[PDB]
Amino acid sequence: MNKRVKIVATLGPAVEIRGGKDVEASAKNIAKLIEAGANTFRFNFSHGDHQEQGERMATVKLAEKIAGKKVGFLLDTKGPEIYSYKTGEKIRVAALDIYDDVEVGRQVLVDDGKLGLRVVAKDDATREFEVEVENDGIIAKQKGVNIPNTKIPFPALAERDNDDIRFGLEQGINFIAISFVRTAKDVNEVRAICEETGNGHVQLFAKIENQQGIDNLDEIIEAADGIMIARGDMGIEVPFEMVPVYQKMIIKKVNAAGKVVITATNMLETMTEKPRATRSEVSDVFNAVIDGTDATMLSGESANGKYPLESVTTMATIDKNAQALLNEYGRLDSDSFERNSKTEVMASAVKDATSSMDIKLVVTLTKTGHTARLISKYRPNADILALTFDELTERGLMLNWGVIPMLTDAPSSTDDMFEIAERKAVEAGLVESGDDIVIVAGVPVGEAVRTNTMRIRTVR
Amino acid sequence: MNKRVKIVATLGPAVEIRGGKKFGEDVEASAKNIAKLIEAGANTFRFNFSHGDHQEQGERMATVKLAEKIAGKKVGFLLDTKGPEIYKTGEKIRVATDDVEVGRQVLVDDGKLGLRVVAEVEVENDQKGVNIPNTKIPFPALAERDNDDIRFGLEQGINFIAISFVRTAKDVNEVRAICEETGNGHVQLFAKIENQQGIDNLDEIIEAADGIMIARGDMGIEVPFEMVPVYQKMIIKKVNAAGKVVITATNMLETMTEKPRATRSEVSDVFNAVIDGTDATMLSGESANGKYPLESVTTMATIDKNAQALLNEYGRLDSDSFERNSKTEVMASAVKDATSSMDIKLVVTLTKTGHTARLISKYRPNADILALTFDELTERGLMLNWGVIPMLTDAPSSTDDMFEIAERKAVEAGLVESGDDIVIVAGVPVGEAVRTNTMRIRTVR
Amino acid sequence: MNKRVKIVATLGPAVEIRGGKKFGEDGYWGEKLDVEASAKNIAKLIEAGANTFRFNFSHGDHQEQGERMATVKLAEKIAGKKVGFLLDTKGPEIRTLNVAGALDIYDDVEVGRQVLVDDGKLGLRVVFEVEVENDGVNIPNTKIPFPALAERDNDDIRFGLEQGINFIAISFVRTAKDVNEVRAICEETGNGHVQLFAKIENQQGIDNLDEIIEAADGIMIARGDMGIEVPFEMVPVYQKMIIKKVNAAGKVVITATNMLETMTEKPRATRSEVSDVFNAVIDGTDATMLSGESANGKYPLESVTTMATIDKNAQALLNEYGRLDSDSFERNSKTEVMASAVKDATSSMDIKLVVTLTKTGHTARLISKYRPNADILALTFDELTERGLMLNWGVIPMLTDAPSSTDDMFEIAERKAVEAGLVESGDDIVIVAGVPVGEAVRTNTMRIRTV
Amino acid sequence: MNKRVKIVATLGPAVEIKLDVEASAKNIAKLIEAGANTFRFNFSHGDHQEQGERMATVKLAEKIAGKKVGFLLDTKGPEIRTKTGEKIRVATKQGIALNVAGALDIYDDVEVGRQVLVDDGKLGLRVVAKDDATREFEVEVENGVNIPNTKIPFPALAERDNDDIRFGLEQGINFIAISFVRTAKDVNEVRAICEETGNGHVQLFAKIENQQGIDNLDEIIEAADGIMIARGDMGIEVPFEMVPVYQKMIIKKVNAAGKVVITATNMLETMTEKPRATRSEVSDVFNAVIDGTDATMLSGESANGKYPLESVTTMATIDKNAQALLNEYGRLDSDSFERNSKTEVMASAVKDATSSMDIKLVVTLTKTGHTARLISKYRPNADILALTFDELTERGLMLNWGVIPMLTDAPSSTDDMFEIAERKAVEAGLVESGDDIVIVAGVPVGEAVRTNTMRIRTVR
Ligand SMILES: O=P(O)(O)OC[C@H]1O[C@](O)(COP(=O)(O)O)[C@@H](O)[C@@H]1O
Ligand SMILES: O=P(O)(O)OC[C@H]1O[C@](O)(COP(=O)(O)O)[C@@H](O)[C@@H]1O
Ligand SMILES: O=P(O)(O)OC[C@H]1O[C@](O)(COP(=O)(O)O)[C@@H](O)[C@@H]1O
Ligand SMILES: O=P(O)(O)OC[C@H]1O[C@](O)(COP(=O)(O)O)[C@@H](O)[C@@H]1O
């Protein structure tokens, strides 16, 4: 019984066992988050340096060979960043001069948006904001400041970020989560690097963190390969009771576009410290599966928590069960999609087959992962083994709902792709004799040009 | 545009030209006539054995075999068995023989004169056929008058038998005993429902039979005349659910027996038979013995063709409720999906027995269904399934590309042209595949 | 079991006794109309379920029409039930050519048009030099400038309003203008209460269907001529699309022509005629019509009774097979939302009767738009609005005293229902009214009450 | 814009100022202004005396806030109070060991292969052998005491339970949540106390904490007046990954029954020691409102947190956003209910009017509060003003979805309840001139059994 929601697990020091408190030891430890249900590790280049990142990547390539399973490599960029008080205390506040881009009536928030300073006056002397306090609270050395609803001219791509992804593209990554995507352009420029440097295979998840990115969700979905729902920044930058509705609506739109969405931040946050999750958190990751998410993500829980292995297995088991109730309660609705291509109508016909019968497995023989993404779109009640013929495409499919990618030789004009499909499934022990599978391919290899053939086969 | 609903035309004198003189005033003359019913959209000729001798039926079936040669199209051959058979308000009268309750009605001449038995009968309103509604009278499940006729038919070469006055599975099974004992298992059996006992046992009759003939004449006398609309909707639904074929019969373009144009109730009634889900519509008297036989076929074909353009909006069958009971079904379902997802011009099934062509027809895709079959008897046996166009082809070799043969037979048929998308289903590889197991979406070159 | 689908029975010589002799007995014409004998012939059609009589002003002079309407006013008193009076206009016409208003059609019949003869059985193709194509006169797809209202129709409608009619059925409606011109006669002469049914009978009438329904009080599908003027195999699609639309408009539809035609000669209808009446009801029609079958046929009483039982049986299956859908309606007024809530109530429990205290019949029309699964008793306060309700689906009109501001209309409602013989005790009814009387502007209260 | 989803706030030291009261009265007072609808006194963290004066404190809180609220008492209910491989032992013996509630021999009920979870389902002791002769247990360590999936005959009515139920009924309460309900009888011998005392008007909420209570859900719902989903204990008694399944299915069965349902546990949990909620917490609160819950519960977040007023104002914000997405995402579907009574069917028409037109308010003239409970079940798109004529059913409606309980003098047989209906709502500040409202009542008053008539009126 396989887990179909993918897990994106952030890495950090928690798994890195430093001289007993060291590669092959902590590679044998992250190879355990792989066996536990992690499909992609996140490297947040906001909390490390290239020397620390470049190392923690060669050590995961070690764990893949320990565990036998491969995983995806995702770089998260850093992107635009910016004494206890009591109410009414009118004060003020001081590399871009954001002076004329924040206006009166805005709100300046410090630390997880925990202290509000409404800007009441435009002091123009020392270029300062005459603000005042709305609630008692702190300002600590170096904590996040968000000025919501403002459109501060941050670069489409900050070169701090430019250098970061360029280093990732040369170690060997598969995805880039772009932080603070406000327009399609913030995506296009990271795209222009992936093609310039010869890495068209990389997939871009835009992170939606503020109102600029929600009011542009369409044109961003169009330009990106996925959406990461960075709820943290979004839950400061827009009303905190609107991220449940914005999350339901993002998962639906992104599924409609045939792309991947990842639901992020705070999913098992207690389990950073304590060894068990609140039932508010088991509710959350469960509901993300019913809203249609491709993948659930661990941030702090996996990177710098006491229980890194525990929060993967936890998510894994919640995800595993919540998949069992998508028939009854599922919110995605494939029956409303326009089938906009021959491969997509085929993907529909496969969903129909799994609804009509007990299909154990769908197999697709796919060069670029297109029919695998499209089958995944329709969320069949069966797992999708995607036989592809190049590791980059294989790794590129590891966040798609239900997809199990697997390398095999590109087939010649003279070999039953249908026996190959049965053979590779059984080798993987995903089907036992008498199981029914749905195999799709473009046949005959040579004249096919797209997936064009659906076959129902019972395993010998 | 191809007529999906099939027409069963009852044969008789109205087209048979005897010594140059028409009916009511020579097989080559009558063959050029029958050739015109065929191009007009007759898919199957009916031979009602209830009115005719064995000399007559033999000679007509002669005439249509020539008609196919003239017409360049084949049709099916249907034998209608005859089977079981038999004053003013207040006159008191008796009649002479255990199955008739004192309370039953007797009706002489086509259910118009009413004898309500009281011990002895009494008239109720102001060698004839008699009905006794709501009685389980033990007519032989297999009569002998019929037993001889059926054997006489299978002799000549027939594809269907319509069993008059079915009321239990026994009445069909014993006619199916005769077909697989003469080595014509290939013959398909329509169970005419005509009375309450038929309707009460309709499920077991559907199961035994290959299809129902909704026999509305007798059925109008035997059940209350205002429930046959209700029965017609519920029989078409159930037969369809059982992957079988339902003919809707008698009185359809009635006044076209005498006048050149149909009443607006008649047009409405053919029209609604399609919307309810009929596989076929039937002309009885209208084409057997009537002044405008070809105009009756042409009118029904024109009506049938329109009503199918509205099956999506108005249509009553609903394939989403069906349970796919075999791997061939879930692929029939998956074909219907394909035709819903994009503009598909034709379904092509390569089919040894026509099983696959029937499950596809069952699902009623929005596309015609070209059936590529390898013997004349499977071919003719598919001519009453909704939307199936039977086309004889050479059995594909172990090297032939059957998706190519599907395209070439369809372009030969003139059912497709360069640009059209088609769905093609097959058993691959040929011979070793136990059932249709492959679906292809092919663009026509 | 009250028949909720109303019937329109055309009257004619078939029910009329002329000196002991029935219609067709040798020497029946130029005799003495036995009016009291003819009145209890007619009176039995009324009991058998005829809800309104059609006087077809194409096959009668003004005196014979005037006399028959008299006989029907008697028949009511025998039957102890009242019916509506319907005038069917002659309309624009051409016959073998004689044209109405002696018009010259020559400058607007283009070439490539058809010319049909006798019930559309023989075709003539304009090349008028015209060729025969196969072995009354219609000219499909033309816009012959027939006056929006001729004069013979003007005089027919006026004679009829004088006698006292409740409905007019306007022949060959091509646009709203044909309707608004008869609506002006009706208002000009005091008869603003009269209701107009447009007969859609041709391509321009169908092309203009929306604006016509907007002008009229409802539609008479006259499938006869419609099937000569448009491709015969469309009449079903048009029947279904007109019923759905006239219902979305909360107006009345009548399905008509050849419905039980075999019964005009032989005494039992064919299977396709029983089919046709059944499907009309399942389609959504308020009303089924008889023409020849009841006017000059050998079994007018039987054809009425047959239509009634098909209609009574068909209605019991509207819940399954029924084509109309009151769920997609937009409720455009507070009375409609009350109509909606009545219909919801008759769906949650068994309701044997809905009652409405209606001054104008509005609430009655809006309730019957929603096709609740009960009967509708309309208690109205004059014979004009009572009779005017008589072709609305499921509506039983009954005249009662206008309630006073010191009256329980809910007890009035129960008392009248028990008087009519529709309820017994323990039955559940929905009652609807504007309370308090003389202060409520509109039907604003519903109540569920045990008899 | 009023709030329809009710809040149950648990009171504790956190709002109270020796214990003063007039100072504690004006903390509790703005909890009511925030949205707190019913106060919960968990009678397992305090004696009869202290919890007595807190109920005295809130009723003057009521009269400074200018709104009345409800009184819920949670029984202590049944209880058992007391690294890998360690083969320890634990004893069934009493007064030696387990502090079984009211003392019991729990031996011949806990079979081998069960599981003894000490310290909040923290530690796991897999029972491996039974010492039939001694009667103790032989366990083996795996990774308060809960023993899942066993029918321990816990005191169906302990006198410790019997004691505090009677002190509440004397002090003026409204609801009793009954802990660890496992059969119908656990509500009967507490309802038999209420009818006894002359307090049949009080309503009982079965707290479902264990598996027996989930196997017996139907007959308990039949016997109780509501369910409190105690996701605290439930997460330990059943597999933690199914409490979101069981929560969704509980709320459905409870709302089909026409009874109240409360989502409790861990809901705004971080809002105890931190000032803003996790994004998994807000999604949790949000989802239970889409699930169709009548009320949402704060425990320690208002009983002993740093931010009790803020926990209620935030929960009040999430409830009023989720309520506005009920016509789109709502899991409850009233179109499937059978309409059993003539009051159900009148409630069904009120629903109809709120979907046929803009209905600002539905008003019920009710005495039992029945009609207001049938209307609430069908969840009309509008608030419910329930007029009833005594503070002893006025209080009991305060946990029903959407209903604003308001008291006035019972009407005379010579009046139009409708006029007084329009008159309360205008005084109540819920409607202005032109508002369309739906009034339901039984007429004529003094000779009419059930709720009888429905009227549509536009506010004078
Ligand atoms: O059916 P569509 O959307 O036109 O996709 C067809 C395209 O996808 C491809 O078939 C790639 O498909 P796979 O990567 O799934 O094998 C291309 O050859 C082809 O051009
Ligand atoms: O898939 P099902 O319904 O079990 O039926 C399969 C059977 O019908 C057949 O497929 C025949 O099908 P066709 O005649 O339509 O090719 C047999 O080969 C097989 O025994
Ligand atoms: O609710 P609506 O459609 O605006 O109807 C309002 C009209 O209905 C009427 O009550 C007519 O109603 P009744 O004839 O049914 O009594 C008028 O007085 C009123 O102006
Ligand atoms: O639910 P039912 O069967 O209509 O019964 C209605 C019940 O509610 C009551 O009408 C109470 O109604 P209220 O809501 O006005 O208090 C009782 O008279 C009656 O027993």
The residue in chain A having the minimum alpha-carbon distance to the alpha carbon of residue D281 is A280
Q: For residues D380-414, b (16+ Cβ closer than 10 Å) or e, as one string?
A: bebbbbbbbeeeebbbbbbbbbbbbbbbeeebeee
- In sequence order, what are the beta bridge partners of C430? C354, C448
Across the interface, whether the CB atoms of B267 and C232 are under 8 A apart is answered yes
Domain B319-443 CATH class label: alpha beta
Burial of D262 (0-12, 13-18, 19+ CB in 10 A): buried
Ligand 1, closest atom to CA A393?
14
- Measure A293 CA to nearest chain B CA, in Å: 25
Angstrom distance (rounded) from CA B295 to CA C254: 30
Level-2 CATH architecture, domain C334-450: 3-Layer(aba) Sandwich (3.40)
DSSP D292: T
Query: What is the rounded distance in angstroms from the CA atom of residue C34 to the CA atom of residue C118?
Result: 35
Q: What span, in angstroms and rounded, lies between the C-alpha atoms of D212 and D190?
A: 18
Q: What is the dihedral of CA D3, D7, D9, D14, to 10 degrees?
A: -30
Region D79-153: CATH code: 2.40.33.10
> In the block, which residue shows the tokens 């009874």?
D259
Say how many CA atoms lie within 13 Å of C119 toward its Cβ. 10
Query: What is the distance in A from the centroid of ligand 3 to the CA of C161?
Result: 26
Joined tokens for residue C132: 């025969």
Peptide bond before residue B429 is cis, with ω within 30 degrees of 0: yes
| Strand A436-441 with B113-117, pairing | unpaired
Resolution of this entry, Å: 2.6
Tokens of B214: 């909704």
Q: What distance in Å separates the CA atoms of residue B7 and residue B174, rounded to the nearest whole number? A: 27
Q: Integer distance in angstroms from the first to the last C-alpha of chain B?
A: 21
C-alpha of residue C203 to centroid of ligand 2, in Å: 50
Any catalytic annotation for residue C73? Answer: no
The answer to whether B366 and B343 are in contact (CB under 8 A) is no
- The DSSP element (H or E) to which A53 belongs, if any, is helix A50-67
B326 CB within 6 A, ligand 2 = yes
Q: Which two tokens stand for residue C394?
A: 């499921």
Q: Is D349 in contact with C336 (Cβ distance < 8 A)?
A: no
Task: Decide if D431 contacts D459 (C-beta within 8 A).
Answer: yes
How far is the CA of C419 from the CAs of C79, C423, C424, in angstroms? 17, 9, 10
The whole-angstrom separation of Cα D241 and Cα B220 is 62
Q: What is the largest CA-CA distance in chain A?
A: 83
In order, the DSSP letters of B189-243 are EEEEE-SHHHHHTHHHHHHHSSEEEEEHHHHHHHS-GGGHHHHHHHHHHHHHHTT
Q: How far apart are CA B419 and CA A269, in angstroms?
A: 57
What is the side-by-side strand order in the sheet with D383-388?
Answer: C395-399, C375-380, C353-357, C428-433, C445-450, D453-458, D436-441, D361-365, D383-388, D403-407
Alpha carbon separation from D310 to D36, D114, D264, D267, D271 (Å, rounded): 11, 42, 17, 14, 8
Per the document, the length of chain B is 445
Query: What would be the CATH architecture of the domain defined by C6-90+148-319?
Result: Alpha-Beta Barrel (3.20)
Say yes or no: CB of residue C363 within 6 Å of ligand 3: yes
Report the gap between the CA of D95 and the closest CA in chain A (Å).
Answer: 32
Distance D369 CA to ligand 4 centre (A): 8
Residues of B in contact with C235 (CB under 8 A): 264, 267-268
Q: Hey, which CATH number is domain B6-82+141-309, 1.10.260.40, 3.40.50.2300, 3.20.20.60, 3.40.50.720?
A: 3.20.20.60
Provide the token pair at A405.
Answer: 């990618």
CA of C447 to the centre of ligand 4 (A): 15
Residue C4 tokens, joined: 């909720």
Contact between C396 and C420 under an 8 Å Cβ cutoff? The reply is yes
List Cα–Cα distances, A361 to A323, A383, B296, B327, B438, in angstroms.
Answer: 15, 5, 54, 15, 16
Please state which of the four CATH numbers 2.60.40.1220, 2.40.33.10, 1.10.730.10, 2.60.410.10 is assigned to the domain occupying A91-146.
2.40.33.10
What is the DSSP code string of B334-396?
HHHHHHHHS---EEEEE-SSSHHHHHHHHH--SSEEEEEESSHHHHHTTTTSTTEEEEE-PPP
Are A245 and D325 a contacting pair at CB < 8 A? yes
Two structure tokens written together for A347: 């993907």
Alpha helices per DSSP H over D292-408:
300-303, 308-322, 326-329, 342-356, 370-377
To which residue do tokens 């069934």 refer? D92
Q: Indicate the DSSP class of residue B262.
A: -
Which fold would CATH assign to domain A6-79+156-325?
A: TIM Barrel (3.20.20)
Testing ligand 1's pocket by substitution, the residue of A337, A362, A394, A450 carrying the most ligand atoms inside 8 A of its CB is A450
Residues whose CB is less than 8 angstroms from the CB of residue C285 and which lie 6 or more positions away in sequence, other chains included = C5, C221, C243, C253, C254, C255
Secondary structure string (H, E, C) spanning chain C: CCCCCEEEEECCHHHCCECCECCCCCCCCCCCECHHHHHHHHHHHHHHCCCEEEEECCCCCHHHHHHHHHHHHHHHHHHCCCCEEEEECCCCCEECCEEHHHCCCCCCCCCCCCCEECCCCEEEEECCCEEECCCCEECCCCCCCCCCCCCHHHHHHHHHHHHCCCEEEECCCCCHHHHHHHHHHHHHCCCCCCEEEEEECCHHHHHCHHHHHHHCCEEEEEHHHHHHHCCHHHHHHHHHHHHHHHHHCCCEEEEECCCCHHHHCCCCCCHHHHHHHHHHHHHCCCEEEECHHHHCCCCHHHHHHHHHHHHHHHHCCHHHHCCCCCCCCCCCCHHHHHHHHHHHHHHHCCCCEEEEECCCCHHHHHHHHCCCCCEEEEEECCHHHHHHCCCCCCEEEEECCCCCCCCCHHHHHHHHHHHHCCCCCCCEEEEEECCCCCCCCCCCEEEEEEC
Within 8 A of C338 by CB-CB distance, chain D residues are 456
DSSP H stretches of helix in D386-433? 417-427
Kindly give the number of the ligand 4 atom that is closest to the alpha carbon of D342: 4
Q: Is B435 in the pocket of ligand 2 (CB under 6 A)?
A: yes
B256's tokens: 């076209």
A355 in contact with D, Cβ within 8 Å: no
| Count of C-beta atoms within a 10 Å radius of residue A378 | 25
Experimental method of this PDB entry: X-ray
Nearest to B215 by CA among B207, C322, B204, B202: B202
D207 burial level (CB within 10 Å; 0-12, 13-18, 19+): buried
| A334-458 CATH pick, 3.40.190.10, 3.40.1380.20, 3.40.50.1370, 1.10.10.10 | 3.40.1380.20
Find residue C138's DSSP bridge partners: C116
Coil/strand/helix, residue A269: helix
Whose Cα sits closest to atom 6 in ligand 1? A450
Task: Please answer yes or no on whether D453 and C445 come within 8 Å at the CB atom.
Answer: yes
* Closest approach atom of ligand 3 to CA C385: 14
How many C-beta atoms surround the C-beta of residue B46 within 10 A?
A: 27
CA distance C55 to C87: 5
The dihedral sign for the CA sequence B283, B287, B289, B292 = positive
Please list every residue in chain D whose beta carbon sits closer than 8 Å to the beta carbon of residue A269: 270, 278, 280
Mutate to test the pocket of ligand 2, among B188, B352, B355, B434 (most ligand atoms within 8 A of CB): B355
Nearest to D180 by CA among D125, D236, D115, D252: D236
Residue nearest to atom 15 of ligand 4 (CA): D366
> Which of these, A219, A230, A232, A81, lies nearest to A158 by C-alpha position?
A81
Considering only CA atoms, which of A73, A82, A67 is closest in space to residue A34?
A67
What subunits make at least 3 CB pairs under 8 angstroms with C? B, D
Quote the minimal CA–CA distance from A339 to chain B in Å. Answer: 6
Question: Is-contact B2 B41, C-beta < 8 A?
Answer: no
C400 is catalytic: no
Q: Answer yes or no: is the C-beta of C368 below 6 A from any ligand 3 atom.
A: no
Q: Is B229 in contact with C275 (Cβ distance < 8 A)? A: yes
E strand or H helix at B407: helix B402-413
Q: Which of D229, D248, D279 to mutate to test the interface with A (most CBs of A within 10 A)?
A: D279
Which residues in chain A have their CB less than 8 angstroms from residue B331's CB? 353, 456
Alpha helix ranges (H) inside D151-278:
159-171, 185-197, 212-215, 217-223, 231-237, 243-256
Alpha-carbon torsion D23, D27, D32, D38, what sign?
negative
Q: Do D352 and C334 touch (CB under 8 A)?
A: no
Report helix, strand or coil for A180: coil
Say which of C337, C436, C447 has its CB closest to residue D357.
Answer: C337
**Using CB atoms within 10 A of its CB, is residue C305 exposed (0-12), middle (13-18) or buried (19+)?**
middle
D40 annotated to a ligand binding site: yes
- According to DSSP, the residues that pair with C228 across neighbouring strands are none
Query: Which atom of ligand 4 is the closest one to the Cα of D373?
Result: 14
DSSP D413: S
A340 in contact with ligand 1, CB cutoff 6 A: no
Minimal C-alpha gap between B434 and chain C (Å): 41
Q: How far apart are CA A242 and CA D282, in angstroms?
A: 9
Considering the segment(s) D6-77+156-325 as one domain, its CATH architecture is: Alpha-Beta Barrel (3.20)
Other CB atoms within 10 A of residue D117 CB: 18
Residues of chain A in contact with residue D287, where contact means CB-CB under 8 angstroms, are 244, 283-284, 287
Answer yes or no: do D356 and C348 touch at CB < 8 A. Answer: no
Q: Which ligand is closest to the CA of B378, given by its number? A: 2
Contact between chains at B439 and A457 (C-beta distance less than 8 A): no
Token reading at C133: 């194509």
Domain layout of chain A by residue ranges: 6-79+156-325, 91-146, 334-458
Quick one: C102 exposed, middle or buried, by C-beta within 10 A (0-12, 13-18, 19+)? exposed
Cα of B443 vs centre of ligand 1, distance in Å, is: 15
Kindly name the residue from C54, C82, C343, C369 that is annotated as catalytic: C54
- Asked if residues D395 and D70 have their Cβ atoms less than 8 Å apart, the reply is yes
Count of H-run helices and E-run strands, chain A: 16, 18
Ligand 3, residues C362, C435, C445: which to mutate, most atoms within 8 A of Cβ?
A: C362
Pairing of strands B76-80, B113-117: unpaired
Helices (runs of H) and strands (runs of E) counted in chain D: 15, 21
Q: Tell me if residue D75 is catalytic.
A: no
Residues 6+ apart with CB under 8 A from A200: A194
Residues in chain D: 460
Q: Is B352 in the pocket of ligand 2 (CB under 6 A)?
A: yes
Q: How far is CA C299 from the centre of its chain?
A: 21
Q: Is B109 exposed, middle or buried, given 0-12, 13-18 or 19+ CB atoms closer than 10 A?
A: exposed
* Facing D266 at nearest CB: one of A269, A280, A322: A280
Q: Which ligand is nearest to the CA of A456?
A: 2
Report the alpha-carbon angle B299-B305-B306, nearest 5. 95
Residue type at D422 in one-letter notation = E
What percent of chain D is helix, strand and coil (3-state, nearest 5)?
40, 20, 45
Residues facing A129 on adjacent strands:
A93
Residue nearest to atom 3 of ligand 1 (CA): A341
For residues D206, D212, D217, D220, the Cα torsion angle rounded to the nearest 10 degrees is -50
C257 is catalytic: yes
Cβ within 8 Å of residue B296, ≥6 positions away: B9, B253, B256, B257, B283, B286, B287, B290
B and A touch with 3+ CB pairs <8 Å, answer yes
